[PDB]
PDB file of all heavy atoms in Angstrom:
ATOM      1  N   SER A  25     103.010  94.924 114.471  1.00  0.00           N
ATOM      2  CA  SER A  25     103.410  96.320 114.476  1.00  0.00           C
ATOM      3  C   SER A  25     103.234  96.896 115.877  1.00  0.00           C
ATOM      4  O   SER A  25     102.239  96.620 116.556  1.00  0.00           O
ATOM      5  CB  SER A  25     102.583  97.128 113.476  1.00  0.00           C
ATOM      6  OG  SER A  25     102.980  96.874 112.139  1.00  0.00           O
ATOM      7  N   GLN A  26     104.202  97.688 116.307  1.00  0.00           N
ATOM      8  CA  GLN A  26     104.068  98.378 117.594  1.00  0.00           C
ATOM      9  C   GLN A  26     102.966  99.427 117.489  1.00  0.00           C
ATOM     10  O   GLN A  26     102.923 100.166 116.503  1.00  0.00           O
ATOM     11  CB  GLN A  26     105.392  99.019 118.003  1.00  0.00           C
ATOM     12  CG  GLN A  26     106.484  98.017 118.400  1.00  0.00           C
ATOM     13  CD  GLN A  26     106.099  97.168 119.587  1.00  0.00           C
ATOM     14  OE1 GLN A  26     106.097  95.938 119.514  1.00  0.00           O
ATOM     15  NE2 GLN A  26     105.774  97.820 120.708  1.00  0.00           N
ATOM     16  N   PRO A  27     102.062  99.516 118.463  1.00  0.00           N
ATOM     17  CA  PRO A  27     100.943 100.462 118.332  1.00  0.00           C
ATOM     18  C   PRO A  27     101.414 101.909 118.360  1.00  0.00           C
ATOM     19  O   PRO A  27     102.351 102.273 119.070  1.00  0.00           O
ATOM     20  CB  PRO A  27     100.061 100.143 119.547  1.00  0.00           C
ATOM     21  CG  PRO A  27     100.502  98.786 120.014  1.00  0.00           C
ATOM     22  CD  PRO A  27     101.956  98.701 119.683  1.00  0.00           C
ATOM     23  N   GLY A  28     100.737 102.743 117.572  1.00  0.00           N
ATOM     24  CA  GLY A  28     100.939 104.173 117.621  1.00  0.00           C
ATOM     25  C   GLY A  28     102.268 104.667 117.093  1.00  0.00           C
ATOM     26  O   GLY A  28     102.731 105.733 117.509  1.00  0.00           O
ATOM     27  N   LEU A  29     102.888 103.927 116.165  1.00  0.00           N
ATOM     28  CA  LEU A  29     104.176 104.332 115.598  1.00  0.00           C
ATOM     29  C   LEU A  29     104.083 104.638 114.113  1.00  0.00           C
ATOM     30  O   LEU A  29     105.107 104.645 113.416  1.00  0.00           O
ATOM     31  CB  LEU A  29     105.231 103.251 115.850  1.00  0.00           C
ATOM     32  CG  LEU A  29     105.715 103.037 117.287  1.00  0.00           C
ATOM     33  CD1 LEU A  29     106.989 102.201 117.300  1.00  0.00           C
ATOM     34  CD2 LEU A  29     105.961 104.354 117.998  1.00  0.00           C
ATOM     35  N   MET A  30     102.881 104.898 113.600  1.00  0.00           N
ATOM     36  CA  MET A  30     102.676 105.294 112.208  1.00  0.00           C
ATOM     37  C   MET A  30     103.348 104.302 111.250  1.00  0.00           C
ATOM     38  O   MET A  30     104.322 104.607 110.562  1.00  0.00           O
ATOM     39  CB  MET A  30     103.175 106.723 111.965  1.00  0.00           C
ATOM     40  CG  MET A  30     102.836 107.274 110.594  1.00  0.00           C
ATOM     41  SD  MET A  30     102.195 108.964 110.656  1.00  0.00           S
ATOM     42  CE  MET A  30     103.451 109.786 111.636  1.00  0.00           C
ATOM     43  N   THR A  31     102.794 103.103 111.240  1.00  0.00           N
ATOM     44  CA  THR A  31     103.226 102.088 110.299  1.00  0.00           C
ATOM     45  C   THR A  31     102.703 102.404 108.900  1.00  0.00           C
ATOM     46  O   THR A  31     101.667 103.049 108.731  1.00  0.00           O
ATOM     47  CB  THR A  31     102.750 100.702 110.739  1.00  0.00           C
ATOM     48  OG1 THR A  31     103.150  99.719 109.771  1.00  0.00           O
ATOM     49  CG2 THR A  31     101.229 100.668 110.903  1.00  0.00           C
ATOM     50  N   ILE A  32     103.443 101.952 107.887  1.00  0.00           N
ATOM     51  CA  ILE A  32     103.019 102.067 106.495  1.00  0.00           C
ATOM     52  C   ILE A  32     102.200 100.858 106.062  1.00  0.00           C
ATOM     53  O   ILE A  32     101.578 100.894 104.994  1.00  0.00           O
ATOM     54  CB  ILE A  32     104.271 102.269 105.622  1.00  0.00           C
ATOM     55  CG1 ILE A  32     104.915 103.619 105.959  1.00  0.00           C
ATOM     56  CG2 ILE A  32     103.935 102.191 104.140  1.00  0.00           C
ATOM     57  CD1 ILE A  32     106.419 103.636 105.857  1.00  0.00           C
ATOM     58  N   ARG A  33     102.141  99.817 106.893  1.00  0.00           N
ATOM     59  CA  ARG A  33     101.501  98.562 106.528  1.00  0.00           C
ATOM     60  C   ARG A  33      99.999  98.716 106.355  1.00  0.00           C
ATOM     61  O   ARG A  33      99.338  99.484 107.061  1.00  0.00           O
ATOM     62  CB  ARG A  33     101.778  97.515 107.616  1.00  0.00           C
ATOM     63  CG  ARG A  33     102.669  96.375 107.174  1.00  0.00           C
ATOM     64  CD  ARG A  33     103.779  96.066 108.177  1.00  0.00           C
ATOM     65  NE  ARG A  33     103.297  95.389 109.376  1.00  0.00           N
ATOM     66  CZ  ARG A  33     103.958  94.422 110.025  1.00  0.00           C
ATOM     67  NH1 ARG A  33     105.122  93.981 109.582  1.00  0.00           N
ATOM     68  NH2 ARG A  33     103.426  93.892 111.105  1.00  0.00           N
ATOM     69  N   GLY A  34      99.459  97.953 105.407  1.00  0.00           N
ATOM     70  CA  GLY A  34      98.026  97.807 105.237  1.00  0.00           C
ATOM     71  C   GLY A  34      97.502  96.573 105.945  1.00  0.00           C
ATOM     72  O   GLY A  34      98.173  95.960 106.779  1.00  0.00           O
ATOM     73  N   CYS A  35      96.275  96.201 105.586  1.00  0.00           N
ATOM     74  CA  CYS A  35      95.591  95.087 106.227  1.00  0.00           C
ATOM     75  C   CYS A  35      95.580  93.866 105.311  1.00  0.00           C
ATOM     76  O   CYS A  35      96.126  93.881 104.202  1.00  0.00           O
ATOM     77  CB  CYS A  35      94.165  95.470 106.598  1.00  0.00           C
ATOM     78  SG  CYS A  35      93.134  95.817 105.160  1.00  0.00           S
ATOM     79  N   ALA A  36      94.923  92.805 105.787  1.00  0.00           N
ATOM     80  CA  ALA A  36      94.810  91.577 105.019  1.00  0.00           C
ATOM     81  C   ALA A  36      93.773  91.694 103.911  1.00  0.00           C
ATOM     82  O   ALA A  36      93.861  90.975 102.908  1.00  0.00           O
ATOM     83  CB  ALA A  36      94.466  90.410 105.948  1.00  0.00           C
ATOM     84  N   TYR A  37      92.787  92.576 104.076  1.00  0.00           N
ATOM     85  CA  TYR A  37      91.837  92.847 103.001  1.00  0.00           C
ATOM     86  C   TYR A  37      92.538  93.496 101.818  1.00  0.00           C
ATOM     87  O   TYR A  37      92.241  93.180 100.657  1.00  0.00           O
ATOM     88  CB  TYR A  37      90.702  93.725 103.516  1.00  0.00           C
ATOM     89  CG  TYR A  37      89.900  94.400 102.432  1.00  0.00           C
ATOM     90  CD1 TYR A  37      88.769  93.795 101.904  1.00  0.00           C
ATOM     91  CD2 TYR A  37      90.265  95.647 101.952  1.00  0.00           C
ATOM     92  CE1 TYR A  37      88.033  94.415 100.911  1.00  0.00           C
ATOM     93  CE2 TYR A  37      89.533  96.272 100.955  1.00  0.00           C
ATOM     94  CZ  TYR A  37      88.422  95.649 100.442  1.00  0.00           C
ATOM     95  OH  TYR A  37      87.694  96.271  99.456  1.00  0.00           O
ATOM     96  N   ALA A  38      93.482  94.405 102.088  1.00  0.00           N
ATOM     97  CA  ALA A  38      94.288  94.981 101.016  1.00  0.00           C
ATOM     98  C   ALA A  38      95.087  93.909 100.289  1.00  0.00           C
ATOM     99  O   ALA A  38      95.226  93.953  99.060  1.00  0.00           O
ATOM    100  CB  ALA A  38      95.220  96.048 101.596  1.00  0.00           C
ATOM    101  N   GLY A  39      95.619  92.931 101.030  1.00  0.00           N
ATOM    102  CA  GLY A  39      96.441  91.901 100.415  1.00  0.00           C
ATOM    103  C   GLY A  39      95.651  90.905  99.598  1.00  0.00           C
ATOM    104  O   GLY A  39      96.188  90.294  98.672  1.00  0.00           O
ATOM    105  N   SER A  40      94.370  90.722  99.914  1.00  0.00           N
ATOM    106  CA  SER A  40      93.518  89.794  99.188  1.00  0.00           C
ATOM    107  C   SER A  40      92.674  90.471  98.113  1.00  0.00           C
ATOM    108  O   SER A  40      92.664  90.034  96.961  1.00  0.00           O
ATOM    109  CB  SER A  40      92.601  89.048 100.167  1.00  0.00           C
ATOM    110  OG  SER A  40      91.540  88.408  99.491  1.00  0.00           O
ATOM    111  N   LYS A  41      91.951  91.534  98.471  1.00  0.00           N
ATOM    112  CA  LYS A  41      91.099  92.215  97.496  1.00  0.00           C
ATOM    113  C   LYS A  41      91.916  93.108  96.570  1.00  0.00           C
ATOM    114  O   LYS A  41      91.834  92.979  95.340  1.00  0.00           O
ATOM    115  CB  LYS A  41      90.035  93.048  98.216  1.00  0.00           C
ATOM    116  CG  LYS A  41      89.083  93.799  97.290  1.00  0.00           C
ATOM    117  CD  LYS A  41      89.544  95.225  97.031  1.00  0.00           C
ATOM    118  CE  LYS A  41      88.723  95.883  95.930  1.00  0.00           C
ATOM    119  NZ  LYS A  41      89.193  97.261  95.633  1.00  0.00           N
ATOM    120  N   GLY A  42      92.702  94.021  97.133  1.00  0.00           N
ATOM    121  CA  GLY A  42      93.422  94.979  96.318  1.00  0.00           C
ATOM    122  C   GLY A  42      94.601  94.409  95.557  1.00  0.00           C
ATOM    123  O   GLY A  42      95.090  95.067  94.638  1.00  0.00           O
ATOM    124  N   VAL A  43      95.053  93.206  95.901  1.00  0.00           N
ATOM    125  CA  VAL A  43      96.296  92.684  95.357  1.00  0.00           C
ATOM    126  C   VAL A  43      96.055  91.451  94.497  1.00  0.00           C
ATOM    127  O   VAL A  43      96.393  91.441  93.306  1.00  0.00           O
ATOM    128  CB  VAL A  43      97.292  92.380  96.489  1.00  0.00           C
ATOM    129  CG1 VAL A  43      98.465  91.541  95.988  1.00  0.00           C
ATOM    130  CG2 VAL A  43      97.795  93.679  97.101  1.00  0.00           C
ATOM    131  N   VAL A  44      95.457  90.415  95.073  1.00  0.00           N
ATOM    132  CA  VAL A  44      95.342  89.131  94.387  1.00  0.00           C
ATOM    133  C   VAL A  44      94.061  89.042  93.572  1.00  0.00           C
ATOM    134  O   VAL A  44      94.097  88.709  92.381  1.00  0.00           O
ATOM    135  CB  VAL A  44      95.449  87.979  95.411  1.00  0.00           C
ATOM    136  CG1 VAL A  44      95.098  86.644  94.764  1.00  0.00           C
ATOM    137  CG2 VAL A  44      96.845  87.929  96.006  1.00  0.00           C
ATOM    138  N   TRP A  45      92.919  89.325  94.180  1.00  0.00           N
ATOM    139  CA  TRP A  45      91.634  89.098  93.528  1.00  0.00           C
ATOM    140  C   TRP A  45      91.185  90.266  92.649  1.00  0.00           C
ATOM    141  O   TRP A  45      90.660  90.044  91.558  1.00  0.00           O
ATOM    142  CB  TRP A  45      90.558  88.802  94.577  1.00  0.00           C
ATOM    143  CG  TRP A  45      90.624  87.396  95.049  1.00  0.00           C
ATOM    144  CD1 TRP A  45      91.150  86.953  96.232  1.00  0.00           C
ATOM    145  CD2 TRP A  45      90.153  86.242  94.358  1.00  0.00           C
ATOM    146  NE1 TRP A  45      91.036  85.584  96.309  1.00  0.00           N
ATOM    147  CE2 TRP A  45      90.427  85.122  95.172  1.00  0.00           C
ATOM    148  CE3 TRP A  45      89.529  86.040  93.121  1.00  0.00           C
ATOM    149  CZ2 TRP A  45      90.102  83.827  94.789  1.00  0.00           C
ATOM    150  CZ3 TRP A  45      89.197  84.752  92.749  1.00  0.00           C
ATOM    151  CH2 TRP A  45      89.491  83.663  93.582  1.00  0.00           C
ATOM    152  N   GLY A  46      91.386  91.499  93.109  1.00  0.00           N
ATOM    153  CA  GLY A  46      90.950  92.667  92.376  1.00  0.00           C
ATOM    154  C   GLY A  46      91.299  92.643  90.900  1.00  0.00           C
ATOM    155  O   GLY A  46      90.451  92.860  90.036  1.00  0.00           O
ATOM    156  N   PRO A  47      92.576  92.389  90.585  1.00  0.00           N
ATOM    157  CA  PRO A  47      93.004  92.433  89.177  1.00  0.00           C
ATOM    158  C   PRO A  47      92.281  91.450  88.266  1.00  0.00           C
ATOM    159  O   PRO A  47      92.241  91.682  87.051  1.00  0.00           O
ATOM    160  CB  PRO A  47      94.504  92.130  89.255  1.00  0.00           C
ATOM    161  CG  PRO A  47      94.904  92.567  90.634  1.00  0.00           C
ATOM    162  CD  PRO A  47      93.719  92.263  91.515  1.00  0.00           C
ATOM    163  N   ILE A  48      91.727  90.361  88.792  1.00  0.00           N
ATOM    164  CA  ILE A  48      90.973  89.417  87.964  1.00  0.00           C
ATOM    165  C   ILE A  48      89.791  90.166  87.369  1.00  0.00           C
ATOM    166  O   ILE A  48      88.882  90.590  88.088  1.00  0.00           O
ATOM    167  CB  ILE A  48      90.527  88.178  88.770  1.00  0.00           C
ATOM    168  CG1 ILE A  48      91.762  87.355  89.169  1.00  0.00           C
ATOM    169  CG2 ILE A  48      89.533  87.343  87.975  1.00  0.00           C
ATOM    170  CD1 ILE A  48      91.463  85.977  89.710  1.00  0.00           C
ATOM    171  N   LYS A  49      89.790  90.320  86.046  1.00  0.00           N
ATOM    172  CA  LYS A  49      88.952  91.330  85.415  1.00  0.00           C
ATOM    173  C   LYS A  49      87.526  90.854  85.143  1.00  0.00           C
ATOM    174  O   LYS A  49      86.581  91.620  85.335  1.00  0.00           O
ATOM    175  CB  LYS A  49      89.593  91.816  84.117  1.00  0.00           C
ATOM    176  CG  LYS A  49      89.772  90.767  83.029  1.00  0.00           C
ATOM    177  CD  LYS A  49      90.559  91.334  81.853  1.00  0.00           C
ATOM    178  CE  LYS A  49      90.711  90.331  80.718  1.00  0.00           C
ATOM    179  NZ  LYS A  49      91.669  90.804  79.678  1.00  0.00           N
ATOM    180  N   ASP A  50      87.335  89.611  84.703  1.00  0.00           N
ATOM    181  CA  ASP A  50      85.993  89.157  84.341  1.00  0.00           C
ATOM    182  C   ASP A  50      85.186  88.687  85.545  1.00  0.00           C
ATOM    183  O   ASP A  50      84.080  88.155  85.366  1.00  0.00           O
ATOM    184  CB  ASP A  50      86.067  88.042  83.289  1.00  0.00           C
ATOM    185  CG  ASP A  50      87.111  86.986  83.616  1.00  0.00           C
ATOM    186  OD1 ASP A  50      87.664  87.010  84.736  1.00  0.00           O
ATOM    187  OD2 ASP A  50      87.378  86.138  82.742  1.00  0.00           O
ATOM    188  N   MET A  51      85.696  88.885  86.756  1.00  0.00           N
ATOM    189  CA  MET A  51      84.987  88.556  87.982  1.00  0.00           C
ATOM    190  C   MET A  51      84.523  89.845  88.657  1.00  0.00           C
ATOM    191  O   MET A  51      85.131  90.905  88.497  1.00  0.00           O
ATOM    192  CB  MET A  51      85.876  87.774  88.951  1.00  0.00           C
ATOM    193  CG  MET A  51      86.136  86.329  88.569  1.00  0.00           C
ATOM    194  SD  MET A  51      87.107  85.456  89.823  1.00  0.00           S
ATOM    195  CE  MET A  51      85.982  85.522  91.219  1.00  0.00           C
ATOM    196  N   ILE A  52      83.437  89.742  89.419  1.00  0.00           N
ATOM    197  CA  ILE A  52      82.964  90.831  90.271  1.00  0.00           C
ATOM    198  C   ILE A  52      83.403  90.520  91.689  1.00  0.00           C
ATOM    199  O   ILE A  52      83.127  89.431  92.218  1.00  0.00           O
ATOM    200  CB  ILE A  52      81.444  91.006  90.164  1.00  0.00           C
ATOM    201  CG1 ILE A  52      81.098  91.565  88.776  1.00  0.00           C
ATOM    202  CG2 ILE A  52      80.929  91.930  91.259  1.00  0.00           C
ATOM    203  CD1 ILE A  52      79.653  92.002  88.588  1.00  0.00           C
ATOM    204  N   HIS A  53      84.103  91.467  92.316  1.00  0.00           N
ATOM    205  CA  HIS A  53      84.597  91.318  93.677  1.00  0.00           C
ATOM    206  C   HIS A  53      83.835  92.275  94.579  1.00  0.00           C
ATOM    207  O   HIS A  53      83.777  93.482  94.303  1.00  0.00           O
ATOM    208  CB  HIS A  53      86.097  91.598  93.748  1.00  0.00           C
ATOM    209  CG  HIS A  53      86.873  91.007  92.617  1.00  0.00           C
ATOM    210  ND1 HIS A  53      87.042  89.654  92.454  1.00  0.00           N
ATOM    211  CD2 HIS A  53      87.514  91.596  91.576  1.00  0.00           C
ATOM    212  CE1 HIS A  53      87.762  89.428  91.367  1.00  0.00           C
ATOM    213  NE2 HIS A  53      88.057  90.587  90.818  1.00  0.00           N
ATOM    214  N   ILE A  54      83.249  91.744  95.643  1.00  0.00           N
ATOM    215  CA  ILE A  54      82.396  92.510  96.538  1.00  0.00           C
ATOM    216  C   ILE A  54      83.163  92.775  97.823  1.00  0.00           C
ATOM    217  O   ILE A  54      83.698  91.847  98.437  1.00  0.00           O
ATOM    218  CB  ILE A  54      81.069  91.788  96.826  1.00  0.00           C
ATOM    219  CG1 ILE A  54      80.177  91.796  95.589  1.00  0.00           C
ATOM    220  CG2 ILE A  54      80.333  92.458  97.985  1.00  0.00           C
ATOM    221  CD1 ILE A  54      80.593  90.819  94.527  1.00  0.00           C
ATOM    222  N   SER A  55      83.216  94.040  98.225  1.00  0.00           N
ATOM    223  CA  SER A  55      83.746  94.411  99.532  1.00  0.00           C
ATOM    224  C   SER A  55      82.621  94.236 100.537  1.00  0.00           C
ATOM    225  O   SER A  55      81.714  95.066 100.623  1.00  0.00           O
ATOM    226  CB  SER A  55      84.278  95.836  99.496  1.00  0.00           C
ATOM    227  OG  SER A  55      85.452  95.904  98.704  1.00  0.00           O
ATOM    228  N   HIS A  56      82.668  93.130 101.276  1.00  0.00           N
ATOM    229  CA  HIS A  56      81.592  92.744 102.184  1.00  0.00           C
ATOM    230  C   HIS A  56      81.837  93.406 103.525  1.00  0.00           C
ATOM    231  O   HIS A  56      82.790  93.065 104.234  1.00  0.00           O
ATOM    232  CB  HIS A  56      81.517  91.223 102.308  1.00  0.00           C
ATOM    233  CG  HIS A  56      80.197  90.723 102.821  1.00  0.00           C
ATOM    234  ND1 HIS A  56      78.996  91.294 102.468  1.00  0.00           N
ATOM    235  CD2 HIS A  56      79.901  89.694 103.648  1.00  0.00           C
ATOM    236  CE1 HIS A  56      78.011  90.641 103.060  1.00  0.00           C
ATOM    237  NE2 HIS A  56      78.536  89.666 103.784  1.00  0.00           N
ATOM    238  N   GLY A  57      80.980  94.358 103.883  1.00  0.00           N
ATOM    239  CA  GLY A  57      81.148  95.124 105.086  1.00  0.00           C
ATOM    240  C   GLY A  57      80.827  96.581 104.848  1.00  0.00           C
ATOM    241  O   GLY A  57      80.168  96.948 103.865  1.00  0.00           O
ATOM    242  N   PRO A  58      81.294  97.454 105.739  1.00  0.00           N
ATOM    243  CA  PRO A  58      81.018  98.883 105.583  1.00  0.00           C
ATOM    244  C   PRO A  58      81.584  99.437 104.281  1.00  0.00           C
ATOM    245  O   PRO A  58      82.268  98.728 103.535  1.00  0.00           O
ATOM    246  CB  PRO A  58      81.684  99.518 106.808  1.00  0.00           C
ATOM    247  CG  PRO A  58      81.825  98.399 107.797  1.00  0.00           C
ATOM    248  CD  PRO A  58      82.036  97.158 106.979  1.00  0.00           C
ATOM    249  N   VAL A  59      81.300 100.710 104.000  1.00  0.00           N
ATOM    250  CA  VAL A  59      81.619 101.277 102.686  1.00  0.00           C
ATOM    251  C   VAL A  59      83.051 101.762 102.573  1.00  0.00           C
ATOM    252  O   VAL A  59      83.487 102.090 101.464  1.00  0.00           O
ATOM    253  CB  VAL A  59      80.609 102.396 102.380  1.00  0.00           C
ATOM    254  CG1 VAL A  59      81.054 103.718 102.998  1.00  0.00           C
ATOM    255  CG2 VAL A  59      80.406 102.528 100.881  1.00  0.00           C
ATOM    256  N   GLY A  60      83.795 101.795 103.675  1.00  0.00           N
ATOM    257  CA  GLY A  60      85.108 102.421 103.645  1.00  0.00           C
ATOM    258  C   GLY A  60      86.119 101.668 102.789  1.00  0.00           C
ATOM    259  O   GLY A  60      86.785 102.259 101.936  1.00  0.00           O
ATOM    260  N   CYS A  61      86.233 100.358 103.006  1.00  0.00           N
ATOM    261  CA  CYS A  61      87.354  99.601 102.438  1.00  0.00           C
ATOM    262  C   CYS A  61      87.339  99.632 100.915  1.00  0.00           C
ATOM    263  O   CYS A  61      88.358  99.923 100.283  1.00  0.00           O
ATOM    264  CB  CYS A  61      87.309  98.161 102.934  1.00  0.00           C
ATOM    265  SG  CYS A  61      86.885  97.985 104.664  1.00  0.00           S
ATOM    266  N   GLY A  62      86.198  99.305 100.307  1.00  0.00           N
ATOM    267  CA  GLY A  62      86.132  99.242  98.856  1.00  0.00           C
ATOM    268  C   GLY A  62      86.333 100.595  98.200  1.00  0.00           C
ATOM    269  O   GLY A  62      86.807 100.678  97.069  1.00  0.00           O
TER     270      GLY A  62
END
């Protein structure tokens, strides 16, 4: 992405936690790091 052009794109954490792993219901998914992402 070109810097400073207000992209709609998210990050790779969104693609892994929020998309693929999050929906798995009987598992606990931990956002490892600061409190913002989770």
Side-chain angles (χ1 to χ4, degrees):
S25 285
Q26 290 299 123
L29 291 194
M30 187 135 51
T31 178
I32 294 146
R33 248 133 73 142
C35 65
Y37 163 91
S40 165
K41 180 266 171 182
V43 167
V44 171
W45 281 102
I48 292 192
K49 63 186 182 189
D50 46 9
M51 287 184 63
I52 291 189
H53 318 291
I54 289 76
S55 290
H56 200 37
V59 84
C61 319

